[PDB]
Structures are given as C-alpha cells and as structure tokens.
Structure 1
Amino acid sequence: TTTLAFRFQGGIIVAVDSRATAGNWVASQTVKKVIEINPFLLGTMAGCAADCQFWETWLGSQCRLHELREKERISVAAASKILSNLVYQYKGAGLSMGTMICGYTRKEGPTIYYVDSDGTRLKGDIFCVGSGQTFAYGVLDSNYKWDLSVEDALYLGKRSILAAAHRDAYSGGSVNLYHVTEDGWIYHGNHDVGELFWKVKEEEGSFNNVIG
C-alpha cells in the first residue's frame, strides 16, 4: 500500500494507490482506499484490509450519530480521536491499521490527522503511510512548497503515488485523487498506472532507469 495526504495553500490533497496483496500474490488492483465519511471528511486506509474497511465505515456511523445528537458536523480532531480511542482499546490484539483522517471545518480549517493501530495520533501538514511511504516521501518532500497551485498540488500527489507504485512491489494498480477545500472534498478521478507511467515518462522526461 501507498497513501499520502498533504496540506497546502489551497486546502488538502489526498492520494492513494489501489493495490491489495496477500504475500507476493497480487489480490486486487482496484481497491478503494479512501473512505468518504461525509462531504467534508475523508479517511485513508493502509494495513489490514478488513480492519481499515470495517472500522472506518464504523467511524462514519459514529460521525453521523454525532451530528444528529449535536446538530453540528463533527470536527476532524473529534473524528480522528474516536478512531484512535477505538484501536487503543484493541491494542495488543493484532489490529493492523495506518490511517489518515483528512477534512475541513470552520473552527479548525483544513486538518490532517495520522492515526495508527498502536494508538499513535498525530496532527500534521504532510504524511505518507504504507509499504511504499518512503518512495512517496522522496518525491513529495523534494517538490513540496506551501505555495503550490491546486493544479500542481494535485499532480505532485499523483506523481508521488506513481513513484511508489513503480518502486514498491506491494503498491500499484491505479491512483485515486482527492482535493479537500472549505466547501468539502472533490474527487479528481481514477488514474491507471498502466497508462499513467508512460504518459508521465514521455511528457516529464523522467524514469530514465526504465527501458523506453
């Protein structure tokens, strides 16, 4: 798996791959690793498939119950903590989750929280999570600036997943792009690495290691 999400001038970019593996067996190339909790909240999934998928859809139900009870959309901090307090109760049981709760609210603004299965919860501007996180970091950090445009930010997030998809054996399939603004999240399409790699190689002139 490879997932990232970073904060910038124009909000939050979220990007993930779509590969699922059982050892060296590529089980799927079309997995949804971004969960749509609500129009303003997103959640990324890395680690055990079931653990992430089950508990983040459960998280969405807890966020829905919050806004029914409190007549107000749940904060990104509160939403991430419900998840972090949940996995903490199961600490040592063997849950495997590396998640990122991304969203916008009025009081907080654009916010990203890293939450994992050993109970770590961290607010931050940039995070990469998964087996190919280091590959995504390499490209993302070396090209990251706060003053990126919405167009350039979307591409960098896509390009960082592609970099990881290429080098990491347990990442690939396709890239899923999201952009989170003050108005909510916006889906920016599914991008197959099969076509995207050659498109990027040709137009960018990168990936010279590969036989063109």
Structure 2
Amino acid sequence: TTIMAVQFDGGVVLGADSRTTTGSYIANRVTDKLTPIHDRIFCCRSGSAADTQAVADAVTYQLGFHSIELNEPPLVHTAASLFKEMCYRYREDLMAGIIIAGWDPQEGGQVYSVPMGGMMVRQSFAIGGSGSSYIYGYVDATYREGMTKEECLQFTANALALAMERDGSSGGVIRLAAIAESGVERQVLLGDQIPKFAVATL
C-alpha cells in the first residue's frame, strides 16, 4: 500500500493505490482504501485489511453519534483522536497505519498521521504504507508551501505513481479525493491516466 494526504488553503487532497495482497497474490486489484468517516472527514488505510476496516467502522459509529449529540459537524482533530485512542489502546493487537484528513469550519483543511503504535501528529502532508519508503526523497524535494488544490492533486498522483512502480505491495489504480467546504470530489486515475516515467534503457 501507498497512502498520502496533503493540506491546501481551504481543504485537503487524499490518495491511495488499490492493491490488497495475501502473500504475493493480489486479492483485490481495485481496493478503495480511502474511507469516509463523516461528510468531510476521510481516512486512508494501510496495514491489515481486517483491522483497518473494523477500526474505521467503529470510529464512524462513535463520530456519528458524537456529531448528532453536539448538533454540529465534527472536528477533524476529533476523528483523528478517536482513531488514535483505539490504535494506541490496542496497539499490540492491530496492524493499522492511518492518515486522517478532512475539513471542518473551525480549523479548515487538516492532515493527521496515526502510524502503527498509535501516536498522532498533524502534518502539512503525510505518506504511509509500505510504498511510502520509495517516495520520501521525491516528496521532500517536490513539496512547496502554498500549493493549490490542483497542484496537490498532481503532486499526490505523481508520488503514488512512483511508489506503485517500485513497491510490489502497491499497484492498480490511483484513487483521489479532494475535501473542502463545498464537499468531496472523488476520482480514479487508471491505465494511461497514471503519470508515467520512462524505465532507463542504455
């Protein structure tokens, strides 16, 4: 898996590859690893498919109930704290590397990492999963403060494409989402729409 999210002024961009593996068998080549937790809050999931689905379902439940009781949209920081609480408490029984990203009216676009072990840190952009190793250098060199939504989408697609090329556990299609006050926009890059970089022939 490769997962990523990036803050911009007014929102966030999230992406993931789409590969689920058991050993080196691809059990799903078009996985949707970006899961809605509330109207403008998503999580990107890496690690164990079972663990991350169960935790996402449980947090969706907690956050939905909390939000009805308060009669307001939830804070992105609150969704992240709920993930963290569960991933930290059960760190010995779960294999879950999560990015929480979304928009709320109080703090705008936000990205939180909850890596394995259950720490939580806010970041300008976050990457995770096995494929993220291959793109640390790329993102460190390419990230610019003040990118637009469209630049964040391009940056995310490029990063994920590079990771997918090199990581056996990542591949398939790129799923993107943009979240802002006006809502959620989802898309898929497939086939020729995935950014392409030549293999280096002599």
TM bracket (short chain): over 0.9
Which residue does the alignment assign to 2:98?
99
2:171 partner SS: coil
The whole-number CA distance in structure 1 between the counterparts of 2:188 and 2:44 is: 15
Helix, strand or coil: the match of 1:132?
A: helix
The alignment's C-alpha RMSD in Å is 1.8
Offset of residue 195 of structure 1: 2.7
CA shift for structure 1 position 10: 5.0
* Alignment-mate amino acid for residue 112 of structure 1: V
| Counterpart residue identity of residue 188, structure 2 | N
Task: Name the counterpart of 2:17.
Answer: 17
Matched residue, 2:193:
196
The alpha carbon displacement at 1:28 in A equals 1.5
Gaps of 5+ in 1: none
Alignment of 1:35-74 (within 5 A): 35-74=35-74
Shift of the 53–210 alpha-carbon distance from structure 1 to 2, 3 Å rule, reads: farther
In structure 1, what is the Cα distance between the partners aligned to 2:201 and 2:165? 10
Tell whether the 8 Å contact from 1:20 to 1:26 is kept in structure 2 after alignment.
yes
Question: Is 35-44 or 149-158 further displaced after alignment?
Answer: 149-158
Residues 10 and 108, structure 2, Cα contact 8 Å, conserved in 1: no
CA 72–190 in structure 1, closer or farther in 2 if over 3 Å, else same: same
Partner-residue secondary structure (3-state), 1:170: coil
Structure 1 stretches of 4+ with a deviation exceeding 6 A read none
Q: Which moved more, 1:128-137 or 1:178-187?
A: 178-187
Say how many residue pairs are matched.
Answer: 202
Contact 1:35 1:57 (8 Å CA) reproduced? no
Answer yes or no: is the 8 Å Cα contact 1:85–1:119 preserved in 2: yes
Q: Which amino acid aligns with 2:72?
A: E
Counterpart for residue 200 of structure 2: 209
| Alignment match, 1:80 | 80
User: CA 1:9 to 1:209, structure 2 compared with 1: closer, same or farther past 3 Å?
Assistant: farther
Distance 2:31 2:78 in 1: 27
Calculate the TM-score normalised by the size of structure 1.
0.88
Contact 1:40 / 1:104 at 8 angstroms: preserved in 2?
Answer: yes
Q: Is the 8 A contact 1:101 1:114 kept in 2?
A: yes
- How far 1:210 moved relative to its partner? 6.3
Cα distance, 1:125 vs. partner? 0.9
Q: Which residue of 2 aligns with 1:169?
A: 168
User: For the Cα contact (< 8 Å) 1:135–1:167, is it kept in 2?
Assistant: yes
Q: Tell me, what secondary structure is at the counterpart of 1:176? A: strand
Asked if 1:186 is matched to 2:151, the reply is no
Unmatched segments (≥5 aa) in structure 2: none
Q: Taking structure 2 as the reference length, what is the TM-score of the superposition? A: 0.92
**1:152, 1:122 → 2: CA distance?**
24
Contact residue 154 and residue 177 of structure 1 kept, 8 A? yes
